PDB file of C-alpha atoms in Angstrom:
ATOM      1  CA  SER A   1      34.440 -11.887 -35.576  1.00 22.71           C
ATOM      2  CA  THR A   2      34.647 -15.131 -33.638  1.00 26.06           C
ATOM      3  CA  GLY A   3      37.242 -17.768 -32.750  1.00 26.90           C
ATOM      4  CA  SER A   4      37.000 -21.435 -31.759  1.00 25.55           C
ATOM      5  CA  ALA A   5      39.886 -23.595 -30.542  1.00 23.68           C
ATOM      6  CA  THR A   6      40.110 -27.067 -29.079  1.00 21.26           C
ATOM      7  CA  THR A   7      41.647 -27.366 -25.619  1.00 21.53           C
ATOM      8  CA  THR A   8      43.294 -30.650 -24.611  1.00 24.81           C
ATOM      9  CA  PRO A   9      44.281 -32.098 -21.203  1.00 27.02           C
ATOM     10  CA  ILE A  10      48.063 -32.246 -20.706  1.00 24.85           C
ATOM     11  CA  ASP A  11      47.940 -35.605 -18.932  1.00 27.52           C
ATOM     12  CA  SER A  12      45.685 -38.425 -17.759  1.00 27.91           C
ATOM     13  CA  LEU A  13      44.574 -36.488 -14.653  1.00 32.15           C
ATOM     14  CA  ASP A  14      43.446 -33.299 -16.433  1.00 32.54           C
ATOM     15  CA  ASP A  15      46.058 -31.367 -14.454  1.00 36.49           C
ATOM     16  CA  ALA A  16      45.768 -28.530 -16.965  1.00 35.73           C
ATOM     17  CA  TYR A  17      44.637 -27.875 -20.529  1.00 37.34           C
ATOM     18  CA  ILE A  18      46.570 -26.594 -23.550  1.00 35.39           C
ATOM     19  CA  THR A  19      45.208 -24.682 -26.508  1.00 35.25           C
ATOM     20  CA  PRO A  20      47.177 -23.955 -29.680  1.00 37.11           C
ATOM     21  CA  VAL A  21      47.906 -20.269 -30.332  1.00 39.36           C
ATOM     22  CA  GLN A  22      49.467 -18.701 -33.419  1.00 39.75           C
ATOM     23  CA  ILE A  23      52.001 -15.960 -32.688  1.00 38.05           C
ATOM     24  CA  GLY A  24      53.849 -13.832 -35.199  1.00 42.25           C
ATOM     25  CA  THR A  25      54.454 -13.844 -38.941  1.00 43.18           C
ATOM     26  CA  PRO A  26      54.896 -16.480 -40.232  1.00 43.66           C
ATOM     27  CA  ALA A  27      52.894 -18.134 -37.481  1.00 42.99           C
ATOM     28  CA  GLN A  28      54.677 -19.802 -34.607  1.00 42.20           C
ATOM     29  CA  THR A  29      52.246 -22.173 -32.914  1.00 46.22           C
ATOM     30  CA  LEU A  30      52.639 -22.565 -29.154  1.00 45.61           C
ATOM     31  CA  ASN A  31      50.424 -24.570 -26.799  1.00 46.14           C
ATOM     32  CA  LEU A  32      49.258 -22.215 -24.056  1.00 48.24           C
ATOM     33  CA  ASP A  33      47.459 -22.706 -20.771  1.00 48.36           C
ATOM     34  CA  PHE A  34      44.367 -20.456 -20.914  1.00 48.94           C
ATOM     35  CA  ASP A  35      44.048 -19.029 -17.422  1.00 45.40           C
ATOM     36  CA  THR A  36      40.940 -17.098 -16.331  1.00 47.00           C
ATOM     37  CA  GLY A  37      42.748 -16.459 -13.042  1.00 52.27           C
ATOM     38  CA  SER A  38      45.557 -14.282 -14.431  1.00 52.78           C
ATOM     39  CA  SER A  39      46.042 -11.589 -17.026  1.00 51.44           C
ATOM     40  CA  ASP A  40      49.455 -12.058 -18.670  1.00 51.62           C
ATOM     41  CA  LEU A  41      50.100 -13.753 -22.014  1.00 47.35           C
ATOM     42  CA  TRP A  42      53.639 -15.053 -21.581  1.00 49.66           C
ATOM     43  CA  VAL A  43      55.695 -17.574 -23.516  1.00 51.03           C
ATOM     44  CA  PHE A  44      58.837 -19.624 -23.442  1.00 52.75           C
ATOM     45  CA  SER A  45      61.119 -17.906 -25.935  1.00 54.35           C
ATOM     46  CA  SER A  46      64.540 -17.591 -27.505  1.00 50.43           C
ATOM     47  CA  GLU A  47      65.319 -15.321 -24.525  1.00 51.01           C
ATOM     48  CA  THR A  48      64.506 -17.932 -21.870  1.00 50.26           C
ATOM     49  CA  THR A  49      67.550 -19.035 -19.830  1.00 50.01           C
ATOM     50  CA  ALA A  50      68.621 -22.189 -21.660  1.00 49.49           C
ATOM     51  CA  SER A  51      68.896 -24.343 -18.529  1.00 49.01           C
ATOM     52  CA  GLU A  52      65.220 -23.559 -17.785  1.00 49.96           C
ATOM     53  CA  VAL A  53      63.911 -24.846 -21.114  1.00 50.00           C
ATOM     54  CA  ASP A  54      63.211 -28.585 -21.321  1.00 49.00           C
ATOM     55  CA  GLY A  55      61.107 -29.638 -24.301  1.00 51.18           C
ATOM     56  CA  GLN A  56      58.858 -26.576 -24.656  1.00 50.70           C
ATOM     57  CA  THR A  57      58.260 -24.911 -27.991  1.00 51.92           C
ATOM     58  CA  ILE A  58      59.674 -21.391 -27.966  1.00 52.73           C
ATOM     59  CA  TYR A  59      58.636 -18.105 -29.522  1.00 53.09           C
ATOM     60  CA  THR A  60      61.499 -16.480 -31.433  1.00 53.51           C
ATOM     61  CA  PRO A  61      60.602 -12.830 -32.004  1.00 51.23           C
ATOM     62  CA  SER A  62      63.538 -12.233 -34.349  1.00 54.86           C
ATOM     63  CA  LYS A  63      61.897 -14.675 -36.791  1.00 56.76           C
ATOM     64  CA  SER A  64      58.597 -12.751 -36.779  1.00 55.95           C
ATOM     65  CA  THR A  65      58.249  -9.856 -39.231  1.00 55.71           C
ATOM     66  CA  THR A  66      55.451  -8.367 -37.130  1.00 53.44           C
ATOM     67  CA  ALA A  67      57.232  -8.502 -33.742  1.00 53.49           C
ATOM     68  CA  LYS A  68      58.261  -5.208 -32.125  1.00 54.95           C
ATOM     69  CA  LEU A  69      60.036  -4.782 -28.805  1.00 54.25           C
ATOM     70  CA  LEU A  70      57.859  -2.861 -26.375  1.00 53.82           C
ATOM     71  CA  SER A  71      60.677  -0.645 -25.261  1.00 55.67           C
ATOM     72  CA  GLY A  72      61.364  -0.496 -21.539  1.00 55.42           C
ATOM     73  CA  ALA A  73      58.580  -2.910 -20.605  1.00 60.68           C
ATOM     74  CA  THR A  74      59.167  -5.750 -18.168  1.00 62.97           C
ATOM     75  CA  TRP A  75      56.932  -8.232 -16.411  1.00 63.09           C
ATOM     76  CA  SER A  76      57.099 -10.514 -13.399  1.00 64.30           C
ATOM     77  CA  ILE A  77      54.373 -12.765 -12.051  1.00 65.87           C
ATOM     78  CA  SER A  78      53.894 -15.133  -9.133  1.00 68.36           C
ATOM     79  CA  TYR A  79      51.052 -17.642  -9.076  1.00 66.30           C
ATOM     80  CA  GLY A  80      49.060 -19.146  -6.204  1.00 68.11           C
ATOM     81  CA  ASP A  81      50.996 -22.411  -6.396  1.00 70.22           C
ATOM     82  CA  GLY A  82      54.273 -20.571  -5.790  1.00 71.94           C
ATOM     83  CA  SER A  83      55.453 -20.729  -9.399  1.00 69.94           C
ATOM     84  CA  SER A  84      56.742 -17.655 -11.231  1.00 69.70           C
ATOM     85  CA  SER A  85      58.169 -16.199 -14.420  1.00 71.07           C
ATOM     86  CA  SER A  86      59.508 -12.866 -15.689  1.00 71.61           C
ATOM     87  CA  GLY A  87      60.975 -11.164 -18.723  1.00 70.26           C
ATOM     88  CA  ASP A  88      60.484  -8.436 -21.330  1.00 69.45           C
ATOM     89  CA  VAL A  89      57.709  -7.704 -23.836  1.00 69.66           C
ATOM     90  CA  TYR A  90      57.032  -7.677 -27.560  1.00 69.04           C
ATOM     91  CA  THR A  91      53.897  -6.756 -29.437  1.00 69.30           C
ATOM     92  CA  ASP A  92      52.917  -9.146 -32.212  1.00 71.21           C
ATOM     93  CA  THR A  93      49.964 -10.681 -34.034  1.00 74.38           C
ATOM     94  CA  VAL A  94      48.215 -13.408 -32.028  1.00 74.98           C
ATOM     95  CA  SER A  95      45.453 -15.675 -33.312  1.00 71.04           C
ATOM     96  CA  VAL A  96      43.299 -18.145 -31.418  1.00 71.21           C
ATOM     97  CA  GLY A  97      41.001 -20.463 -33.336  1.00 72.70           C
ATOM     98  CA  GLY A  98      40.832 -18.087 -36.300  1.00 70.99           C
ATOM     99  CA  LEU A  99      40.376 -14.896 -34.257  1.00 72.25           C
ATOM    100  CA  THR A 100      43.263 -12.475 -34.773  1.00 72.32           C
ATOM    101  CA  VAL A 101      44.485  -9.604 -32.578  1.00 71.19           C
ATOM    102  CA  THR A 102      47.196  -7.280 -33.851  1.00 70.16           C
ATOM    103  CA  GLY A 103      49.497  -5.503 -31.402  1.00 69.26           C
ATOM    104  CA  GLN A 104      48.979  -8.030 -28.609  1.00 66.92           C
ATOM    105  CA  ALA A 105      51.503  -7.834 -25.776  1.00 67.14           C
ATOM    106  CA  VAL A 106      53.477 -11.088 -25.882  1.00 67.79           C
ATOM    107  CA  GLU A 107      55.519 -11.359 -22.701  1.00 70.94           C
ATOM    108  CA  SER A 108      58.776 -13.141 -23.396  1.00 72.16           C
ATOM    109  CA  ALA A 109      60.164 -15.162 -20.488  1.00 70.18           C
ATOM    110  CA  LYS A 110      63.787 -14.644 -19.524  1.00 68.91           C
ATOM    111  CA  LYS A 111      63.295 -16.729 -16.366  1.00 69.32           C
ATOM    112  CA  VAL A 112      60.768 -19.379 -15.341  1.00 70.25           C
ATOM    113  CA  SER A 113      60.503 -21.348 -12.103  1.00 71.52           C
ATOM    114  CA  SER A 114      61.143 -25.070 -11.873  1.00 73.15           C
ATOM    115  CA  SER A 115      57.512 -26.186 -12.200  1.00 73.46           C
ATOM    116  CA  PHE A 116      57.270 -24.545 -15.628  1.00 73.04           C
ATOM    117  CA  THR A 117      60.568 -26.020 -16.815  1.00 73.31           C
ATOM    118  CA  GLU A 118      59.467 -29.458 -15.616  1.00 74.08           C
ATOM    119  CA  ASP A 119      56.246 -29.309 -17.614  1.00 73.28           C
ATOM    120  CA  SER A 120      57.258 -29.866 -21.234  1.00 72.37           C
ATOM    121  CA  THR A 121      53.675 -29.676 -22.475  1.00 70.77           C
ATOM    122  CA  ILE A 122      52.953 -26.035 -21.538  1.00 74.34           C
ATOM    123  CA  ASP A 123      54.672 -23.409 -23.699  1.00 76.89           C
ATOM    124  CA  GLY A 124      53.222 -20.469 -21.750  1.00 72.84           C
ATOM    125  CA  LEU A 125      50.021 -18.953 -20.358  1.00 71.75           C
ATOM    126  CA  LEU A 126      47.247 -16.865 -21.908  1.00 72.42           C
ATOM    127  CA  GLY A 127      45.558 -14.831 -19.196  1.00 73.26           C
ATOM    128  CA  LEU A 128      41.812 -14.217 -19.359  1.00 72.64           C
ATOM    129  CA  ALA A 129      41.114 -12.448 -16.066  1.00 72.62           C
ATOM    130  CA  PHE A 130      40.697  -8.670 -16.029  1.00 71.04           C
ATOM    131  CA  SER A 131      43.469  -6.501 -17.458  1.00 68.81           C
ATOM    132  CA  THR A 132      43.858  -4.667 -14.127  1.00 69.58           C
ATOM    133  CA  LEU A 133      45.891  -7.728 -12.976  1.00 69.25           C
ATOM    134  CA  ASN A 134      48.358  -7.556 -15.858  1.00 69.75           C
ATOM    135  CA  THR A 135      51.923  -7.284 -14.526  1.00 72.33           C
ATOM    136  CA  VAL A 136      53.619  -5.324 -17.324  1.00 71.57           C
ATOM    137  CA  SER A 137      55.487  -2.272 -16.095  1.00 70.43           C
ATOM    138  CA  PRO A 138      55.559   0.687 -16.499  1.00 68.01           C
ATOM    139  CA  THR A 139      52.607   0.496 -18.914  1.00 67.53           C
ATOM    140  CA  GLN A 140      50.042  -2.174 -18.034  1.00 67.48           C
ATOM    141  CA  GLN A 141      48.901  -4.220 -21.027  1.00 64.04           C
ATOM    142  CA  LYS A 142      45.547  -5.653 -22.104  1.00 63.76           C
ATOM    143  CA  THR A 143      44.598  -9.326 -22.328  1.00 61.82           C
ATOM    144  CA  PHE A 144      43.888 -11.064 -25.618  1.00 59.65           C
ATOM    145  CA  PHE A 145      40.163 -10.982 -24.780  1.00 59.70           C
ATOM    146  CA  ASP A 146      40.182  -7.278 -23.948  1.00 63.08           C
ATOM    147  CA  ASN A 147      41.953  -6.479 -27.201  1.00 61.49           C
ATOM    148  CA  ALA A 148      39.593  -8.684 -29.229  1.00 60.27           C
ATOM    149  CA  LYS A 149      36.382  -7.559 -27.534  1.00 59.21           C
ATOM    150  CA  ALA A 150      35.340  -4.690 -29.785  1.00 58.32           C
ATOM    151  CA  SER A 151      35.674  -6.897 -32.869  1.00 58.01           C
ATOM    152  CA  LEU A 152      33.752  -9.854 -31.454  1.00 60.69           C
ATOM    153  CA  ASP A 153      30.155 -10.568 -32.478  1.00 61.58           C
ATOM    154  CA  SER A 154      29.331 -10.674 -28.757  1.00 63.90           C
ATOM    155  CA  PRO A 155      31.736  -9.632 -25.955  1.00 64.64           C
ATOM    156  CA  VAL A 156      32.031 -13.127 -24.468  1.00 64.91           C
ATOM    157  CA  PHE A 157      34.193 -16.187 -24.331  1.00 68.70           C
ATOM    158  CA  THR A 158      33.174 -19.657 -23.201  1.00 74.04           C
ATOM    159  CA  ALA A 159      35.054 -22.503 -21.522  1.00 72.12           C
ATOM    160  CA  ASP A 160      33.924 -26.053 -22.222  1.00 72.58           C
ATOM    161  CA  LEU A 161      36.543 -28.237 -20.559  1.00 72.20           C
ATOM    162  CA  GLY A 162      36.480 -31.982 -21.020  1.00 73.85           C
ATOM    163  CA  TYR A 163      36.774 -34.757 -18.458  1.00 72.30           C
ATOM    164  CA  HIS A 164      39.651 -36.901 -19.719  1.00 72.52           C
ATOM    165  CA  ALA A 165      38.826 -35.554 -23.177  1.00 70.10           C
ATOM    166  CA  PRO A 166      39.286 -32.495 -25.374  1.00 73.95           C
ATOM    167  CA  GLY A 167      37.015 -29.461 -25.059  1.00 74.06           C
ATOM    168  CA  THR A 168      36.634 -26.003 -26.540  1.00 72.59           C
ATOM    169  CA  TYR A 169      37.296 -22.315 -25.935  1.00 72.95           C
ATOM    170  CA  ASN A 170      35.044 -20.089 -28.053  1.00 71.78           C
ATOM    171  CA  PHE A 171      35.342 -16.328 -28.476  1.00 73.09           C
ATOM    172  CA  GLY A 172      32.526 -14.046 -29.524  1.00 69.08           C
ATOM    173  CA  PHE A 173      29.590 -16.474 -29.560  1.00 68.21           C
ATOM    174  CA  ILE A 174      27.654 -18.950 -27.444  1.00 68.61           C
ATOM    175  CA  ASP A 175      27.374 -22.410 -29.048  1.00 70.51           C
ATOM    176  CA  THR A 176      23.809 -23.364 -28.149  1.00 69.88           C
ATOM    177  CA  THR A 177      24.515 -27.002 -29.110  1.00 69.30           C
ATOM    178  CA  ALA A 178      27.270 -27.360 -26.484  1.00 69.33           C
ATOM    179  CA  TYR A 179      25.087 -27.473 -23.371  1.00 66.47           C
ATOM    180  CA  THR A 180      21.808 -28.848 -22.070  1.00 66.27           C
ATOM    181  CA  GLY A 181      18.951 -26.860 -20.559  1.00 67.32           C
ATOM    182  CA  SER A 182      19.437 -23.145 -19.970  1.00 70.17           C
ATOM    183  CA  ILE A 183      22.383 -20.980 -18.944  1.00 70.49           C
ATOM    184  CA  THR A 184      22.066 -19.389 -15.489  1.00 69.34           C
ATOM    185  CA  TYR A 185      23.856 -16.073 -15.146  1.00 72.56           C
ATOM    186  CA  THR A 186      25.215 -14.712 -11.892  1.00 75.38           C
ATOM    187  CA  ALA A 187      26.840 -11.432 -10.854  1.00 76.56           C
ATOM    188  CA  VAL A 188      30.587 -10.828 -11.025  1.00 74.13           C
ATOM    189  CA  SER A 189      32.758  -8.568  -8.913  1.00 73.45           C
ATOM    190  CA  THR A 190      35.846  -7.292 -10.715  1.00 73.33           C
ATOM    191  CA  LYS A 191      37.178  -5.616  -7.543  1.00 73.51           C
ATOM    192  CA  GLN A 192      40.073  -8.087  -7.183  1.00 68.72           C
ATOM    193  CA  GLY A 193      40.594  -8.465 -10.952  1.00 71.71           C
ATOM    194  CA  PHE A 194      39.083 -11.964 -11.085  1.00 73.57           C
ATOM    195  CA  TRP A 195      35.898 -13.547 -12.376  1.00 74.85           C
ATOM    196  CA  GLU A 196      34.630 -13.493  -8.806  1.00 71.32           C
ATOM    197  CA  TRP A 197      31.110 -14.641  -8.025  1.00 73.50           C
ATOM    198  CA  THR A 198      28.979 -16.076  -5.203  1.00 72.19           C
ATOM    199  CA  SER A 199      27.718 -19.657  -5.295  1.00 74.40           C
ATOM    200  CA  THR A 200      24.396 -20.189  -3.531  1.00 72.04           C
ATOM    201  CA  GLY A 201      25.425 -23.403  -1.768  1.00 71.25           C
ATOM    202  CA  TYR A 202      26.282 -27.077  -2.067  1.00 74.23           C
ATOM    203  CA  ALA A 203      25.265 -30.683  -1.623  1.00 70.59           C
ATOM    204  CA  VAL A 204      27.305 -33.836  -1.060  1.00 70.02           C
ATOM    205  CA  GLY A 205      26.178 -36.855  -3.026  1.00 71.54           C
ATOM    206  CA  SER A 206      22.441 -37.412  -2.694  1.00 76.91           C
ATOM    207  CA  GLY A 207      22.312 -35.247   0.426  1.00 74.44           C
ATOM    208  CA  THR A 208      20.168 -32.194   0.974  1.00 74.43           C
ATOM    209  CA  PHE A 209      21.288 -28.876  -0.478  1.00 76.38           C
ATOM    210  CA  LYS A 210      22.788 -26.423   2.001  1.00 76.71           C
ATOM    211  CA  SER A 211      21.974 -22.820   1.128  1.00 75.11           C
ATOM    212  CA  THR A 212      25.008 -20.737   1.925  1.00 74.20           C
ATOM    213  CA  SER A 213      26.900 -18.022   0.085  1.00 75.62           C
ATOM    214  CA  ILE A 214      30.356 -19.043  -1.143  1.00 75.95           C
ATOM    215  CA  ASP A 215      32.375 -16.242  -2.745  1.00 73.80           C
ATOM    216  CA  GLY A 216      35.019 -17.529  -5.143  1.00 75.82           C
ATOM    217  CA  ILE A 217      36.698 -17.237  -8.529  1.00 73.93           C
ATOM    218  CA  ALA A 218      36.187 -19.098 -11.785  1.00 73.64           C
ATOM    219  CA  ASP A 219      39.766 -20.123 -12.546  1.00 72.53           C
ATOM    220  CA  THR A 220      40.614 -22.353 -15.501  1.00 74.34           C
ATOM    221  CA  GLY A 221      44.284 -22.198 -14.500  1.00 76.48           C
ATOM    222  CA  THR A 222      43.756 -23.994 -11.191  1.00 78.35           C
ATOM    223  CA  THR A 223      43.316 -27.776 -11.277  1.00 76.16           C
ATOM    224  CA  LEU A 224      41.221 -28.415  -8.176  1.00 75.18           C
ATOM    225  CA  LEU A 225      38.175 -27.069  -6.335  1.00 73.39           C
ATOM    226  CA  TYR A 226      39.197 -25.111  -3.199  1.00 67.44           C
ATOM    227  CA  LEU A 227      36.359 -24.390  -0.758  1.00 66.57           C
ATOM    228  CA  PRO A 228      35.895 -23.435   2.919  1.00 66.99           C
ATOM    229  CA  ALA A 229      37.096 -25.976   5.477  1.00 70.16           C
ATOM    230  CA  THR A 230      33.548 -26.579   6.714  1.00 68.23           C
ATOM    231  CA  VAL A 231      32.339 -27.559   3.214  1.00 67.37           C
ATOM    232  CA  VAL A 232      35.369 -29.720   2.462  1.00 65.89           C
ATOM    233  CA  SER A 233      35.102 -31.535   5.795  1.00 67.06           C
ATOM    234  CA  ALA A 234      31.439 -32.297   5.088  1.00 66.78           C
ATOM    235  CA  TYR A 235      32.382 -33.761   1.692  1.00 66.75           C
ATOM    236  CA  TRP A 236      35.241 -36.012   2.831  1.00 66.02           C
ATOM    237  CA  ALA A 237      33.289 -37.210   5.887  1.00 67.73           C
ATOM    238  CA  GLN A 238      31.199 -39.201   3.370  1.00 68.56           C
ATOM    239  CA  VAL A 239      34.238 -41.147   2.128  1.00 64.03           C
ATOM    240  CA  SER A 240      35.349 -44.052   4.324  1.00 63.02           C
ATOM    241  CA  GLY A 241      38.991 -43.698   5.271  1.00 60.52           C
ATOM    242  CA  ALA A 242      39.441 -40.168   3.935  1.00 60.14           C
ATOM    243  CA  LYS A 243      41.595 -37.825   5.970  1.00 55.01           C
ATOM    244  CA  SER A 244      43.536 -34.606   5.777  1.00 52.96           C
ATOM    245  CA  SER A 245      47.243 -35.310   5.586  1.00 50.46           C
ATOM    246  CA  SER A 246      49.654 -32.501   6.438  1.00 50.31           C
ATOM    247  CA  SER A 247      52.501 -34.609   5.025  1.00 48.96           C
ATOM    248  CA  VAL A 248      50.814 -34.963   1.632  1.00 48.39           C
ATOM    249  CA  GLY A 249      49.311 -31.477   1.686  1.00 47.97           C
ATOM    250  CA  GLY A 250      45.574 -32.102   1.705  1.00 49.59           C
ATOM    251  CA  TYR A 251      42.783 -34.630   1.780  1.00 49.81           C
ATOM    252  CA  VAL A 252      43.607 -38.143   0.669  1.00 49.89           C
ATOM    253  CA  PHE A 253      41.342 -41.178   0.419  1.00 47.26           C
ATOM    254  CA  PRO A 254      41.629 -44.902  -0.239  1.00 48.39           C
ATOM    255  CA  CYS A 255      42.002 -45.526  -3.953  1.00 49.81           C
ATOM    256  CA  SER A 256      39.448 -48.363  -3.515  1.00 49.50           C
ATOM    257  CA  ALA A 257      36.702 -45.825  -2.666  1.00 47.26           C
ATOM    258  CA  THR A 258      33.818 -44.763  -4.846  1.00 46.29           C
ATOM    259  CA  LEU A 259      33.498 -40.993  -4.448  1.00 44.86           C
ATOM    260  CA  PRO A 260      30.201 -39.143  -4.044  1.00 44.07           C
ATOM    261  CA  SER A 261      29.266 -36.313  -6.375  1.00 44.32           C
ATOM    262  CA  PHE A 262      29.458 -32.673  -5.295  1.00 44.16           C
ATOM    263  CA  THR A 263      26.803 -30.137  -6.291  1.00 43.32           C
ATOM    264  CA  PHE A 264      27.282 -26.373  -6.291  1.00 43.12           C
ATOM    265  CA  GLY A 265      24.620 -23.700  -6.663  1.00 42.38           C
ATOM    266  CA  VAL A 266      24.438 -21.052  -9.340  1.00 41.68           C
ATOM    267  CA  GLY A 267      21.467 -18.940  -8.373  1.00 42.10           C
ATOM    268  CA  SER A 268      18.558 -21.382  -8.286  1.00 40.98           C
ATOM    269  CA  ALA A 269      20.408 -23.750 -10.655  1.00 44.84           C
ATOM    270  CA  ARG A 270      22.675 -26.658  -9.711  1.00 49.13           C
ATOM    271  CA  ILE A 271      25.885 -27.990 -11.270  1.00 50.61           C
ATOM    272  CA  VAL A 272      26.746 -31.596 -10.400  1.00 46.49           C
ATOM    273  CA  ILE A 273      30.388 -32.683 -10.331  1.00 46.31           C
ATOM    274  CA  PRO A 274      30.475 -36.485 -10.682  1.00 45.85           C
ATOM    275  CA  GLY A 275      32.498 -38.322  -8.046  1.00 43.99           C
ATOM    276  CA  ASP A 276      34.989 -39.605 -10.616  1.00 42.03           C
ATOM    277  CA  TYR A 277      36.019 -35.998 -11.375  1.00 42.13           C
ATOM    278  CA  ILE A 278      37.215 -35.660  -7.769  1.00 44.23           C
ATOM    279  CA  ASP A 279      39.708 -38.559  -8.032  1.00 45.50           C
ATOM    280  CA  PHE A 280      43.252 -37.328  -8.731  1.00 47.80           C
ATOM    281  CA  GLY A 281      44.838 -40.713  -8.380  1.00 49.66           C
ATOM    282  CA  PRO A 282      47.707 -42.136  -6.351  1.00 49.61           C
ATOM    283  CA  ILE A 283      49.708 -39.627  -4.325  1.00 49.99           C
ATOM    284  CA  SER A 284      52.848 -41.323  -5.661  1.00 48.80           C
ATOM    285  CA  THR A 285      53.284 -44.028  -8.266  1.00 49.49           C
ATOM    286  CA  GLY A 286      51.863 -47.326  -7.029  1.00 48.15           C
ATOM    287  CA  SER A 287      50.343 -45.933  -3.832  1.00 47.85           C
ATOM    288  CA  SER A 288      46.872 -46.966  -2.694  1.00 47.18           C
ATOM    289  CA  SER A 289      46.331 -43.511  -1.192  1.00 46.69           C
ATOM    290  CA  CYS A 290      44.655 -41.192  -3.689  1.00 44.59           C
ATOM    291  CA  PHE A 291      44.606 -37.393  -3.765  1.00 47.52           C
ATOM    292  CA  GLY A 292      41.282 -35.555  -3.495  1.00 50.17           C
ATOM    293  CA  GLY A 293      40.018 -33.051  -6.032  1.00 50.03           C
ATOM    294  CA  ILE A 294      38.207 -30.952  -3.424  1.00 49.38           C
ATOM    295  CA  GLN A 295      40.550 -29.260  -0.955  1.00 48.28           C
ATOM    296  CA  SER A 296      40.369 -26.564   1.708  1.00 48.95           C
ATOM    297  CA  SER A 297      40.888 -22.931   0.728  1.00 48.89           C
ATOM    298  CA  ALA A 298      41.822 -22.011   4.307  1.00 46.35           C
ATOM    299  CA  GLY A 299      45.001 -19.962   4.110  1.00 43.70           C
ATOM    300  CA  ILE A 300      44.734 -19.424   0.335  1.00 41.82           C
ATOM    301  CA  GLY A 301      42.561 -16.451   1.172  1.00 44.15           C
ATOM    302  CA  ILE A 302      40.038 -17.121  -1.583  1.00 47.41           C
ATOM    303  CA  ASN A 303      37.771 -19.930  -2.760  1.00 45.77           C
ATOM    304  CA  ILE A 304      38.664 -21.252  -6.216  1.00 44.22           C
ATOM    305  CA  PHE A 305      36.297 -22.911  -8.679  1.00 44.99           C
ATOM    306  CA  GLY A 306      39.074 -24.602 -10.639  1.00 42.28           C
ATOM    307  CA  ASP A 307      38.952 -27.159 -13.430  1.00 40.09           C
ATOM    308  CA  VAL A 308      37.311 -29.855 -11.245  1.00 39.31           C
ATOM    309  CA  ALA A 309      34.233 -27.622 -11.003  1.00 35.02           C
ATOM    310  CA  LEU A 310      34.367 -25.837 -14.338  1.00 33.14           C
ATOM    311  CA  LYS A 311      34.692 -29.001 -16.431  1.00 31.59           C
ATOM    312  CA  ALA A 312      31.300 -30.119 -15.108  1.00 29.11           C
ATOM    313  CA  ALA A 313      29.712 -27.113 -16.864  1.00 31.69           C
ATOM    314  CA  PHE A 314      29.535 -24.984 -19.952  1.00 28.86           C
ATOM    315  CA  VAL A 315      30.808 -21.644 -18.659  1.00 29.98           C
ATOM    316  CA  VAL A 316      30.151 -18.222 -20.168  1.00 32.84           C
ATOM    317  CA  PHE A 317      32.547 -15.412 -19.355  1.00 33.64           C
ATOM    318  CA  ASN A 318      30.477 -12.351 -20.253  1.00 34.63           C
ATOM    319  CA  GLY A 319      32.691  -9.281 -20.707  1.00 35.93           C
ATOM    320  CA  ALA A 320      29.880  -6.810 -21.316  1.00 37.69           C
ATOM    321  CA  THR A 321      30.102  -3.416 -19.593  1.00 34.77           C
ATOM    322  CA  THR A 322      28.706  -5.127 -16.499  1.00 35.62           C
ATOM    323  CA  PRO A 323      30.402  -8.542 -16.543  1.00 35.43           C
ATOM    324  CA  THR A 324      28.579 -11.723 -15.520  1.00 35.81           C
ATOM    325  CA  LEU A 325      29.249 -15.477 -15.440  1.00 31.27           C
ATOM    326  CA  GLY A 326      26.916 -18.087 -16.892  1.00 31.15           C
ATOM    327  CA  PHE A 327      26.800 -21.798 -16.085  1.00 31.36           C
ATOM    328  CA  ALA A 328      24.927 -24.588 -17.828  1.00 30.09           C
ATOM    329  CA  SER A 329      24.932 -28.324 -17.478  1.00 33.19           C
ATOM    330  CA  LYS A 330      26.215 -30.307 -20.465  1.00 33.98           C
TER     331      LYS A 330
END
């Protein structure tokens, strides 16, 4: 089997991407944030505290003939940005782009933090990291990808995120028309439950490439590119007027600037992030100070290849017995 679904930016800055997902019988379609940095499929639901729902589409398990309470199971998750959610668990039929999994754990939110409530466009998350990170207790549950894997033509999914435009998540096949040149594969460590890999270095604009190992995670659920302070300082030093602002919470730059590109290494290959991808616009409405798309990972504890980086590539998440990550230009 295979699946193919279009993923769409939630706003004009590509802050996140939503992908329609069919849950239950008859289908209830919710728009989920596919997150390769976590491993829970959770949804706004009929059980979500009413004051914490503001415009989201909800899953109502009582209206699904295939929903079954997973007795005794609870979940609770906290994300890197300080947001969180928790609730109980149903199993139900879940389909993405024509690919169907029966008995998928659908984690129903009883509580969500303010950032989720305030984002009317995201009806939940679909985790695509390794199932060892799944938060269901007392019986850990498998991700949609893990459940689908055996049925897939090939044990892979691909992320093809757009810049200010729709893109695609595919399951079970590599669309050879979706990228240019060849795909370069690189080793993955699953030790922390993430798609964790080591970039071979970077360049700023037309500058020379610096060979240096940068361990980090491929994370579709994080907006920006978080890298070591040394790397980030070297980037922003090439932008007149750029500075790190503790009050704003990162590097800002004059909105009048033209940003240089940023290149990262994948083995001997190179992925180029155009400068425009690094512009996240005014810090507040009408400001001439703009927020940078490359920020320091110092005190996150991990480097994060978020959407800023991933949307510059066609990315293969290879879930074979020995997992790997592939990157191509597009």
